[PDB]
């Protein structure tokens, strides 16, 4: 049981379109290119990264501009919006 934050900036729109459509199911699209993902067992993380490798091989660009961050139970507590609204609460 781990929360993660998924962010990217891939240059070509069609190449990152498959990234976006793959990542819709795993977590909500919280912002333009940012995803909130919840995992139960690391094997799902491994297979998701394997598919991300598949599409970045498809792009033939070698984009390492995919970044995963963690979101702990109290890291959520101090997280918010500009208007003070709490965010990423489950």
């Amino acid at each position: 049981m781990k929360h993660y934050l998924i962010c990217f900036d891939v240059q070509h729109d069609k190449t990152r379109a498959k990234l976006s459509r793959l990542l819709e199911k795993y977590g909500p699209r919280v912002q333009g290119s940012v995803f909130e993902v919840s995992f139960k067992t690391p094997d799902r993380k491994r297979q998701l990264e394997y598919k991300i490798h598949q599409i970045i091989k498809q792009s033939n660009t070698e984009e390492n501009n995919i970044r995963f961050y963690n979101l702990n139970k109290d890291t959520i507590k101090h997280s918010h919006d500009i208007n003070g609204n709490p965010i990423a609460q489950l």
Binding site: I82, N83, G84, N85
Partner: protein
């Protein structure tokens, strides 16, 4: 040439005594109209020849010994309405007594009434053209302010589409200068035709403008709109338009002017050469002014009984009563001069006036309360005492849907430092009429605090002093005028049950205003102790006035920012 003919207006001012305990509504044109209709019994022709001006408005509870003054205006040539009116009115002794009658134009009393003075059309043209000659620089804005008589009923572009009560004007945007001039021409042409190229010319010659409007909707338990606006004049206007303005000052504009609705007055710019035209401002005025009602003894005793609970009296009381009686004599003499404030510790430091002036202010508040309460109940910017709980929760949830996720504790105190006084005085002058009390009111609100040989002033024409009796009454009377200034900054107020609640999107401007105020007060204390300053002018921050001794954001933002909000 604009009007090739017109009837000869004539008038009577009647002053009558009250011998009984009588109570009026807020607008008095209905009762006086019914009085003349049940008295004269003329039938249809009373609509064609007569009209009513009632100077007294907004005074609800009359009393024995109090008089009453109103004006009757008649139109036509060789009429005998005034004759039978005189003969019937002389014997009107109870209820209603009679003091006197005065001719409107000559000013002599009603006796020797063979023929009265005739406001001929040529006289209207003279009193307009000479005014134009004595007021034309051709590079002047010539602003004149327009006050209503609390009601008018006009049609915005004569819209047939809206089809109902909505068909009337009820806000500033529906005021069109061409629309007003067209309605004025319609009424004048109707009155002339009872006894075309022209309508084209008046379409071209519109140069006038409507500035800083304050007009709103009052629904008499009917409908009407009331308020004032600055009508501004460009130099290309000819005296012909002014003649129409001055004649319509008496004939009227709008629907159903027979019931006296739809008249106004205009107070020209000051420092002009004294030229009084048509109707004189000192004739159409309340017979017993407001200040006489202030100095009536039983109201003063009532005020003394009201204030003495948190009086913290420490001196001899016979001197206080002699002082209030002497000040009553001075006010009747029109020579009073208010004392300046004094700063007393309670803990917190509060600046209050000496107790006898506080008594006079409480007396004025007691006098003013019923009319203002009745006008807040009968107006659009009205508190809703009986709140529909489902509707109020629905309004809160709708505002949450708008984005206003934070609420604040509601206190009127926070809005004492932002009030712009001339708007308030203008609104009162429109409701209760021209009066010598209003000047006195300003002299009570704009005083200077003395603390330890330091004079703390305030910015001119801004603010209401905390710790005064008139302030809580007059603050929420004109609270609605802040709505636009709350709209730009993302604030909303919801009113219910003589109360309200404050809704906001975010809390950053409040904290910046609070931090700006704190820094300003620290610099002021430093420049007290270092450069030996002696006259300090503060714009904001009076609540922490004890602190000194022991871009611009509006001043209510700081007072909100001193608090900590809550979510819904």
């Amino acid at each position: 040439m604009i009007l090739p003919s017109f009837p000869d207006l004539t008038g009577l001012v009647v002053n009558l005594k009250f011998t009984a305990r009588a109570e009026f509504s807020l607008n008095h044109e209905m009762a006086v109209d019914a009085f003349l209709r049940h008295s004269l019994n003329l039938g249809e022709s009373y609509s064609h020849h007569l009209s009513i001006i009632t100077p007294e408005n907004g005074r609800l509870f009359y009393r024995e010994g109090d008089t009453y003054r109103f004006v009757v205006i008649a139109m036509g040539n060789q009429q005998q309405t005034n004759s039978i009116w005189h003969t019937l009115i002389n014997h009107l002794r109870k209820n209603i007594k009679l003091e006197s009658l005065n001719d409107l134009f000559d000013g002599i009393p009603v006796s020797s009434k063979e023929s009265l003075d005739a406001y001929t059309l040529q006289r209207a043209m003279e009193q307009g053209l000479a005014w134009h000659k004595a007021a034309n620089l051709t590079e002047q804005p010539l602003d004149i302010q327009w006050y209503w008589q609390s009601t008018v009923r006009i049609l915005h572009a004569d819209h047939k589409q809206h089809k109902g009560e909505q068909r009337y004007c009820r806000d500033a945007v529906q005021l069109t200068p061409l629309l007003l001039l067209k309605r004025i021409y319609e009424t004048l042409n109707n009155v002339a035709t009872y006894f075309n190229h022209q309508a084209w010319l008046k379409e071209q010659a519109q140069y006038i403008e409507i500035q800083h409007p304050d007009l709103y909707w009052i629904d008499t338990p009917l409908g009407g709109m009331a308020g004032n606006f600055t009508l501004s004049l460009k130099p290309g206007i000819e005296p012909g338009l002014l003649a129409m303005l001055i004649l319509t000052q008496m004939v009227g504009v709008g629907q159903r002017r027979t019931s006296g609705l739809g008249k106004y007055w205009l107070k020209h710019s000051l420092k002009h050469a004294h030229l009084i035209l048509g109707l004189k401002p000192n004739r159409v005025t309340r017979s017993q002014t407001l200040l006489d009602c202030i100095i009536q003894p039983h109201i003063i005793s009532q005020a003394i009984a009201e204030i003495e609970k948190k009086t913290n009296i420490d001196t001899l009381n016979e001197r206080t009563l002699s002082q209030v009686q002497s000040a009553i004599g001075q006010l009747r003499k029109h020579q009073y001069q208010a004392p300046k404030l004094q700063g007393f510790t309670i803990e917190r430091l509060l600046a209050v006036s000496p107790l006898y002036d506080r008594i006079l202010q409480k007396a004025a508040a007691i006098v003013l309360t019923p009319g203002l309460d009745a006008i807040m109940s009968q107006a659009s910017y009205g508190y809703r005492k009986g709140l529909s709980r489902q509707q109020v929760r629905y309004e809160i949830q709708n505002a949450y849907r708008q984005g206003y996720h934070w609420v604040y504790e509601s206190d009127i105190e926070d809005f004492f430092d932002a009030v712009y006084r001339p708007q308030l005085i203008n609104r009162l002058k429109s409701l209760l009429g021209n009066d010598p009390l209003w000047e006195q009111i300003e002299s009570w609100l704009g005083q200077d605090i003395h603390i330890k040989d330091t004079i703390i002033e305030r910015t001119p024409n801004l603010g209401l002093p905390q710790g005064s009796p008139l302030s809580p009454l007059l603050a929420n009377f004109i609270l609605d005028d802040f709505d636009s200034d709350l709209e730009t900054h993302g604030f909303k107020i919801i009113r219910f049950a003589d109360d309200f609640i404050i809704l906001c999107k975010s809390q950053h401007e409040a904290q910046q205003a609070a931090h700006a105020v704190e820094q300003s007060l620290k610099e002021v204390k430093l420049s007290i102790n270092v450069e030996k300053t002696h006259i300090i002018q503060l714009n904001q921050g009076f609540r922490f006035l004890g602190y000194l001794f022991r871009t611009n954001l509006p001043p209510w933002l700081a007072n909100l920012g001193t608090k900590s909000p809550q979510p819904l």
